[PDB]
């Protein structure tokens, strides 16, 4: 209901957490947080004293909803939403909520920040991934200064084509939690990947820990003598590593520590995109998104293109982890399932964890929702039931649907209110709510 106290106003952001149960609202450099099932009043924490925002800043929230990351091309701030506190007066207690800060000027030619993401599987959301104009990707441990940031995809002293991955436009984590997909532009658009891309303390539940252990065992058995020597090495390394994880995994916290040695990994790619649409050779890839299909880490990779087109991809081969190998390719395979031409300028892709097989595409004045659960639901059934038959006949067409007309790329948020899931569309000038089916 747009008639909730936390919403009334006078840069604006809004985020939700725990199945649209908790709301976070940013306005006038003040954080407002309200738990729909727990509080009777909302609370605030004015942070102007620490940071005054300008329309140039981007702010994202950890999925857990416990942390906010505010950043621009020069600096990064990480604040803790005071869930549980009610009267945040103590100037000393309010500074406690300022958890981490970073400026590029902190380094001795300084590349500016292009994008920031929380690592989806870091314990206590303690890891932020930073992509710079550099095409350099860095991981900072928000909770530990006794940790020197890790820099991956460092520049090379090479000449010629493809020394390392250059011209990265977007980043996106696989729903597996251990893989980082990169969309670059050097040649019109390609996909690379860091596997594994681990934080310093990995969030891993028992179900997931056994899933990668078993996948690791299946590949180890899959080894024969024709197998490439470099591949054989990686597969064995993967099994050794995943086994060591299993040995130090803390079941009560569902976490495991990861030594700096295992975190330096070299990019894999480019991935093969089969069959690649001929038209697209004349355009450039814009964004990449990952959409969950079921509850077993099965996902669809989505990529944007200049022509207002979308290609829904599926990874058929199992990758092996790699750390040294340069230009390692191997089972770096993606298959095209469908192409969606929206004939509109796609400005961004967004997903809400609470809704499987659905993707929001923000064009120029519309927010459309591509819904591919028509076929995706069957696709996961066959993957899980090892039966290809169902696929026969199925028309892989996604249901396109206009959500609303916008003017300024709005801020989205899923809000579960009184048995009715909704979508909050936030913009400089407005704050709209809309019903969502399912």
């Amino acid at each position: 209901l747009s008639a909730l106290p936390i919403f009334q106003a006078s840069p604006r952001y809004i985020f939700s957490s725990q199945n649209g149960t908790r709301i976070v609202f940013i306005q006038d450099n003040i954080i407002r947080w309200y738990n729909v099932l727990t509080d009777s009043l909302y609370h605030s924490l004015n942070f102007s004293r620490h940071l005054v925002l300008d329309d140039t800043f981007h702010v994202i929230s950890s999925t857990s909803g416990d942390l906010l990351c505010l950043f621009n091309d020069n600096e990064i701030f990480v604040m803790e939403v005071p869930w549980g506190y009610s009267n945040v007066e103590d100037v000393s207690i309010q500074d406690a909520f300022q958890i981490f800060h970073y400026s590029i000027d902190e380094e001795e030619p300084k590349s500016s920040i292009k994008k920031v993401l929380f690592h989806p599987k870091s314990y206590r959301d303690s890891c932020i991934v930073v992509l710079k104009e550099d095409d350099t990707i860095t991981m900072f441990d928000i909770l530990n200064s006794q940790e020197k940031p890790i820099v991956l995809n460092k520049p090379n002293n090479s000449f010629g084509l493809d020394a390392r991955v250059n011209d990265i436009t977007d980043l996106e984590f696989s729903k597996d939690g251990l893989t980082l997909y990169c969309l670059n532009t050097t040649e019109g658009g390609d996909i690379f990947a860091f596997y594994p891309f681990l934080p310093s303390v990995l969030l891993l539940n028992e179900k997931d820990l056994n899933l990668i252990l078993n996948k690791s065992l299946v590949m180890y058995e899959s080894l024969d003598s024709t197998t490439d020597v470099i591949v054989k090495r990686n597969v064995i390394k993967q099994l050794q590593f995943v086994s060591k994880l299993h040995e130090n995994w803390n079941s009560r916290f569902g976490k495991v520590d990861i030594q700096k040695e295992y975190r330096l990994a070299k990019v894999q790619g480019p991935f093969t995109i089969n069959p690649f649409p001929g038209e697209l050779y004349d355009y450039t890839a814009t964004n990449i998104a990952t959409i969950l299909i079921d509850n077993g880490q099965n996902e669809i990779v989505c990529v944007s293109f200049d022509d207002g087109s979308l290609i829904l991809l599926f990874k058929d081969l199992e990758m092996s982890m790699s750390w040294d190998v340069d230009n390692y390719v191997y089972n770096n395979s993606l298959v095209l399932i469908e192409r969606v031409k929206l004939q509109r300028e796609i400005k961004s892709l967004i997903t809400l964890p609470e809704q499987l097989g659905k993707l929001y595409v923000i064009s120029d004045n519309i927010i459309q929702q591509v819904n591919f659960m028509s076929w995706a639901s069957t696709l996961s059934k066959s993957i899980n039931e090892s039966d290809l038959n169902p696929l026969a006949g199925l028309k892989f067409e996604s249901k396109l649907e206009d959500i609303a007309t916008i003017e300024r790329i709005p801020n989205l948020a899923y809000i579960n209110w009184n048995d009715q899931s909704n979508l909050a569309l936030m913009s400089n000038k407005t704050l709209t709510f809309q019903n969502i089916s399912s």
């Binding site: 078993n214 299946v218 599926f314 990874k315 298959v335 899980n384 290809l388």
Partner: peptide, 26 residues
């Protein structure tokens, strides 16, 4: 783990599904 056969089967099914979509589009 146990589930190994189960996991290997799923991985193998995905390959088969890979060909399906390869030999579905031109």
């Amino acid at each position: 783990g146990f589930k190994v056969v189960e996991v290997g089967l799923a991985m193998n099914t995905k390959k088969q599904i890979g060909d399906f979509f390869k030999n579905l589009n031109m």
